[PDB]
Amino acid sequence: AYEWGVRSTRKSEPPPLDRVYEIPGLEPITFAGKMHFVPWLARPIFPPWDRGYKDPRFYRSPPLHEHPLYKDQACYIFHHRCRLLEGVKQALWLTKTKLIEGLPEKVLSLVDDPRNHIENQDECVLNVISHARLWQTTEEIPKRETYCPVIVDNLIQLCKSQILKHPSLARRICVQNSTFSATWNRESLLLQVRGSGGARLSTKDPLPTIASREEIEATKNHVLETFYPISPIIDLHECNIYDVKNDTGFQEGYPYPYPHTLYLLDKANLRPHRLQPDQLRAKMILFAFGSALAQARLLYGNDAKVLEQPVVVQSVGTDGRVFHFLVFQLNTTDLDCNEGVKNLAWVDSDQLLYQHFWCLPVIKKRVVVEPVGPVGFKPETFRKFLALYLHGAA
């Protein structure tokens, strides 16, 4: 088979050893005593050198197999950069969860009452879009690495203005730079989710359970869809040096220990560096499951069992224009088997807040065809965003 790496680019082989070395009982006269190369003396054989002390800028790590945390069994790690080939279907299998299309009626009813609507909601949201896409910087056309984080921050700020109507909204904070870890087994495969990036909306109170005990028991019939010949662990980081860490990201005693929403961004400027919609939704499911599992392992121990009190975690994933909404309920920690009570995930996909934005006027033959500003604004998208925020408070 074709071998990669042409020989001319490979390290040259050591030069032929001087034949004086072959002769037994003969001591070669080399240039080592001279401390420099000469063509007419033999090449010295130098013994291996060891610095003998610690120099951090010239450190060399030990061989991989000799690391203390090296294990023969591989742990497949899903981190913020992992892009699943099969998208949600792969995530559904890994987390032993059943998918329901659309958000829960409990959540969506919160914004059906016009008393919960923000004052001048449509105008307020439109200004947020215009700020992020146009007025933000000194540059004519803000880039996605710029407006995507800001559009999410300002929308959360808009929702946070409702502390007046709902005093319970003062019991939550938006935390940055938090990370979490959870390990579990699926069909004898060791899996780990390491969550990082985005914003963690943290509450003092746990989110109400969504599904009744009757729906949780009705998931026993559901069969997880398989996708032979692709393995469930494709696109995961196969690691052989790891610790079985279960971490919520905070030390004991943190006033806001409960994860409420996980805001995940896909802000890369280049399209090939942005997750596809299905891949982003898969990341949301795994991150929501990871946060929920870390909470369950903390509160209810490391045992494998159907949870008497399900853990509910939400996630909002966006690239700045398209929004995805997830409500995840962790019903069980007995994940190694494919049969039994399954977790539940409510997913509302591909919710366009706006179709397009014109930063400059479109002038054809000295006539302004399109004005600057958002095109195709959908207020329903923000209504779902507000409903998820209001969940657990209003």
59 sits near another protein (criterion: CB under 8 A): no
Closest CA to 193 of 282, 310, 274: 282
Residues 6+ apart with CB under 8 A from 264: 197, 198, 280, 283, 284, 287, 315, 316, 317, 318
The distance of closest approach from Cβ of residue 331 to another protein in the complex, given in angstroms and rounded to an integer, is 28
DSSP code, position 42: B
Q: What is the DSSP string of 88-155?
A: HHHHHHHTTEEEEES--HHHHHTTTSTTSSPTTHHHHHHHHHHIIIIISSSSSS--HHHHHHHHHHHH
CB 148 within 8 A of CB 266: yes
Among 2, 4, 49, 135, binds RNA (CB under 7 A): 49
Which CB sits closer to another protein, 136 or 209? 136
CA-CA-CA-CA dihedral for 206, 207, 208, 213, to nearest 10: -90
226 sits near another protein (criterion: CB under 8 A): no
Q: How far apart are the C-alpha atoms of 316 and 323, rounded to whole Å?
A: 7
233 sits near another protein (criterion: CB under 8 A): yes
141 sits near RNA (criterion: CB under 7 A): yes
> Residue 229's binding partner, choosing from another protein, RNA, none, with beta-carbon cut-off 5 to 8 A by kind?
another protein
Q: How far apart are the C-alpha atoms of 139 and 165, rounded to whole Å?
A: 38
- Part in contact with RNA (CB under 7 A); list of ranges 141-149, 162-170, 219-227, 324-332: 141-149
The DSSP bridge partners found for residue 368 are 363
Among 90, 95, 97, 178, binds another protein (CB under 8 A): 178
130 sits near another protein (criterion: CB under 8 A): yes
> Residue 135's binding partner, choosing from another protein, RNA, none, with beta-carbon cut-off 5 to 8 A by kind?
another protein
81 sits near RNA (criterion: CB under 7 A): yes
For residue 75, the surrounding DSSP H or E stretch is strand 70-79
In the region spanning residues 31 to 50, those forming contacts with another protein, defined by CB under 8 A, are 32, 34-39, 44, 46, 49
DSSP code, position 234: T
How many beta carbons lie within 10 A of that of residue 193, not counting itself?
26
Q: How far apart are the C-alpha atoms of 372 and 129, rounded to whole Å?
A: 12
The distance of closest approach from Cβ of residue 176 to RNA in the complex, given in angstroms and rounded to an integer, is 15
72 sits near another protein (criterion: CB under 8 A): no
The distance of closest approach from Cβ of residue 316 to RNA in the complex, given in angstroms and rounded to an integer, is 18
> Residue 127's binding partner, choosing from another protein, RNA, none, with beta-carbon cut-off 5 to 8 A by kind?
another protein
CB 88 within 8 A of CB 94: no
Among 12, 61, 138, 188, binds another protein (CB under 8 A): 138
Among 4, 6, 27, 51, binds RNA (CB under 7 A): 51
Q: How far apart are the C-alpha atoms of 224 and 215, rounded to whole Å?
A: 16
362 sits near RNA (criterion: CB under 7 A): yes
The DSSP bridge partners found for residue 327 are 314, 346
The distance of closest approach from Cβ of residue 188 to RNA in the complex, given in angstroms and rounded to an integer, is 21
Positions that interact with another protein (CB under 8 A): 1-2, 4-6, 8-9, 32, 34-39, 44, 46, 49, 51, 53-57, 85, 127, 130-131, 134-138, 150, 153-154, 157, 160-161, 163-164, 169-170, 173-179, 196, 228-231, 233-234, 236, 238, 247, 249-251, 253-256
Q: Would you tell me which residues interact with RNA (CB under 7 A)?
A: 12, 14-15, 37, 39-40, 46, 48-51, 54-64, 67-69, 77, 79-81, 83, 85, 141, 143-144, 194, 196, 235, 237, 239, 241-243, 268-273, 276, 279, 319, 321, 355-362, 364-366
